[PDB]
Design a protein around this ligand. Sequence first.
Ligand SMILES: Nc1nc2c(ncn2[C@@H]2O[C@H](COP(=O)(O)OP(=O)(O)O)[C@@H](O)[C@H]2O)c(=O)[nH]1
Ligand code: ALF
Ligand SMILES: [Mg+2]
Lengths: 322, 182
Amino acid sequence: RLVKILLLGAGESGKSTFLKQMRIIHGQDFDQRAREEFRPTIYSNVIKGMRVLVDAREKLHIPWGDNKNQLHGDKLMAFDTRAPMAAQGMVETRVFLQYLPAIRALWEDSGIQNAYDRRREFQLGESVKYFLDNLDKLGVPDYIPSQQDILLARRPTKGIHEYDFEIKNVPFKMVDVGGQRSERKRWFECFDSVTSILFLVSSSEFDQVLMEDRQTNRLTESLNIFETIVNNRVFSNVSIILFLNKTDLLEEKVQVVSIKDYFLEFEGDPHCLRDVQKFLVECFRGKRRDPLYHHFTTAINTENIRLVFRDVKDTILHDNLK
Amino acid sequence: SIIGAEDEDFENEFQSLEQVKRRPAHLMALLQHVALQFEPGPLLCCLHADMLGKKAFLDFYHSFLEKTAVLRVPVPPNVAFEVQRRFVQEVVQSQQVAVGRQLEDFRSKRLMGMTPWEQELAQLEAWVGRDRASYEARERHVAERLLMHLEEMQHTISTDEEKSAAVVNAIGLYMRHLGVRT
Ligand SMILES: Nc1nc2c(ncn2[C@@H]2O[C@H](COP(=O)(O)OP(=O)(O)O)[C@@H](O)[C@H]2O)c(=O)[nH]1
Ligand code: ALF
Ligand SMILES: [Mg+2]
């Protein structure tokens, strides 16, 4: 009598963030304690991201905004990301404060801002900027991550995790897996007795390549993962819902980059959010060999996810009927 | 060259049919894959043909050739018109394109980590030795587990209870020929 929902998708598609919204909306949410557990992760996010920005400034040959910052850049590439704590994506507060000055100055350097604008050439999460723009609140000694910071915190998922919750006597078991190519080898261990599959796709990564090989287009990879999944007979009697996520990031992106420059099979106004969403929808629908539900979400917007999941919930129930 | 922020987190992270028809564990992964994704007939057809090389020709016929078999495959007109080695050889020939795509798709997905039992195939492909006989024993033992697993959760192969069973019996028959049983 349990409703078993699979969260599937490529790496960084919003799977865990969707699961945190479930907890917020249909669970006990996160209190000061729960949220305070994300601080180490958020500090790891900032430090490691700045170090990528600094390394990219040098390797891309982008002039410093201010040459004196070459010193901080160095104090940053000196951070040992392989030390025991940092290797688990955790940084202690007092360590974080020691680097705050070098980081805050670095973020103000116009040359670091230039590397950022060209992130599609290397590997970075858009969330670092959110946190970089909020250093004044992470700088406070008594810093406690807001609910918003918790949803933006970035922690790569590895393995299989289950989250049981309830929505009016109905029992729900939500399975969260990793999306990297190496984590996918594990998916098959949670395929049985599945009720539905929520398939997350970052609609904004059409101008990006994979972390696994730095060559494969990120949207191209989702299309292919979706193809193997939407055509597996093990799911023939399982509803599959598509979540074109990060819609907020796609809105910003279609203004500065043309998807036409990546998918020549595209037609229409590349700078029109509506035309790009139509195309993305057509590409996924086009992968089915022979009932495709979809929503445009922004997993970090609690209110957006509440409306959407309400609709997904009645879909997963009325379909499980036949 | 440029540093990735999640690069350290993941640090430690079937060319042709003729090449996989004698490797039971790898063939089971492909077989499994094809059964959940495409039309299982073509591949089961080529594996049984190769097994033929007289009474094991009536089986093959009622399973793949005769227009009514649960596992029918496209036959060249000429063949379907009419030596015994000619047809089988030809029938196989007309499955290549279909089996070529299935193979290709399987190789792509595997690079993507989307194919079944990569873990078992990794542990297996890992072990080293010069003892062919004992290496093959390892292949079979793994293949048994996989075959055992294919038989269990297979009602998902097809709705046609007869189809999914024609598929399982077809794979068991072939697995049996390579020394693999459940
Ligand atoms: N701006 C924005 N960020 C998002 C959205 N969804 C997820 N993220 C962020 O993208 C990163 C990866 O999200 P995550 O849940 O860890 O992806 P997973 O790898 O599929 O679990 C995080 O830092 C999330 O905060 C979104 O809709 N908009
Ligand atoms: F990038 Al993942 F789970 F797919 F953190
Ligand atoms: Mg995750």
